[PDB]
Amino acid sequence: MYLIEPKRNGKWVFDGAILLAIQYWAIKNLKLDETIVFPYICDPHVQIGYFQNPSVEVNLELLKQKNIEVVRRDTGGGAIYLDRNGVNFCFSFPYEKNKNLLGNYAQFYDPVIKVLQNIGIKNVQFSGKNDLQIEGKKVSGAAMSLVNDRIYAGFSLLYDVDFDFIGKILTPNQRVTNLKNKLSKEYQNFSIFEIKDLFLTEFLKVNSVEKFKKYELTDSDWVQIDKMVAEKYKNWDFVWGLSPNYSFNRSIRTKVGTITFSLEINEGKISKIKISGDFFPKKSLLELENFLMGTKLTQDQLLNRLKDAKLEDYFSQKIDEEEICNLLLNL
Numbered sequence: 001m002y003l004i005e006p007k008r009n010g011k012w013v014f015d016g017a018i019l020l021a022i023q024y025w026a027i028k029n030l031k032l033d034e035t036i037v038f039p040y041i042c043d044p045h046v047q048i049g050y051f052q053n054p055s056v057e058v059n060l061e062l063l064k065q066k067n068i069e070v071v072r073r074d075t076g077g078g079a080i081y082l083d084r085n086g087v088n089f090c091f092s093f094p095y096e097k098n099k100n101l102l103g104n105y106a107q108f109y110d111p112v113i114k115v116l117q118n119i120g121i122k123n124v125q126f127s128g129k130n131d132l133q134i135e136g137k138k139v140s141g142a143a144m145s146l147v148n149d150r151i152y153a154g155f156s157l158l159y160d161v162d163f164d165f166i167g168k169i170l171t172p173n174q175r176v177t178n179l180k181n182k183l184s185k186e187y188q189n190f191s192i193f194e195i196k197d198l199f200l201t202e203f204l205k206v207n208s209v210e211k212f213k214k215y216e217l218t219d220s221d222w223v224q225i226d227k228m229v230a231e232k233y234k235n236w237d238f239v240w241g242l243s244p245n246y247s248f249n250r251s252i253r254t255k256v257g258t259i260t261f262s263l264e265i266n267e268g269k270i271s272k273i274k275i276s277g278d279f280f281p282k283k284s285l286l287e288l289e290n291f292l293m294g295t296k297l298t299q300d301q302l303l304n305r306l307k308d309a310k311l312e313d314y315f316s317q318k319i320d321e322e323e324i325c326n327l328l329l330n331l
């Protein structure tokens, strides 16, 4: 198991966008045939999933007011708020050695639950979706995707929360707790760097690993990471361009999550379409949106096109194609 701390010439980095960039850089460029761990503690910012639209997920005025960034990550899932009171861990798992991990939140979280138990946390449970919950209240969210031969997976930990701010800055569908007061009393006043440390030590134990193999980002890695920051994580086209607000917007709750269709209509046909939501598609939806372009907004064309798109190739659960058809027929 490798550990990549987000350090630059020995300085700890807290920029959420750079932190993802580090991870994705590793994913793409670090051919280590071992799990790499990426602990990260970020300055306040909102991180949204790849398929999400920041405009509908964030209170944009509160974000501007508080002068904090939106950062889109590469994985699906939903929008989280991240500050110095959260400790997150991403991973680059060799896909061949963890073939059953893709989409398997339970497996992914098993060592985490184990770590949290070991650390005195009451009754942390896998939510069954992609979360960890104590007595109804979410303490962690997770996301993953397959990229190259690597599974990119990450979970957050809400060590301490600003409950007021979190429910104000995130506008989903328009509840969570801290871990601080829930650890063994020995740990209850640990700072965030101490929790990260405690968690990583515990994570090694729970995973039967004596020590992390050391990987320090070199100047040269940083040049590539900085480039991915410029071209992607802090690139408007990626953060904002990716999810345009088209004229018509409809959403359905489905098993995979809330799917929103944002589309343009010219001559009774879908002219532009953007499918967004907090889900975890099997492959990129760009192909599906492209497939749907040109479809007449009639039952017959929509049903057929939606059938032909083989939605199961794109989403894990079954989507009601007719639900989507009928939703779109109303425009």
Ligand SMILES: Nc1ncnc2c1ncn2[C@@H]1O[C@H](COP(=O)(O)OC(=O)CCCC[C@@H]2CCSS2)[C@@H](O)[C@H]1O
Binding pocket: 073, 075, 076, 077, 078, 079, 080, 081, 082, 086, 088, 089, 090, 130, 131, 138, 139, 140, 141, 142, 143, 153, 154, 155, 156, 157, 158, 166, 170, 172, 175, 176, 278
């Ligand atoms: N920092 C944070 N951590 C955990 N849960 C949060 C957080 N912020 C908000 N929430 C709550 O989760 C829901 C949205 O959860 P939802 O289930 O929609 O999706 C997620 O959680 C994505 C997890 C983040 C993936 C990153 C890849 C490695 S590190 S983390 C939001 O509305 C809040 O109620």
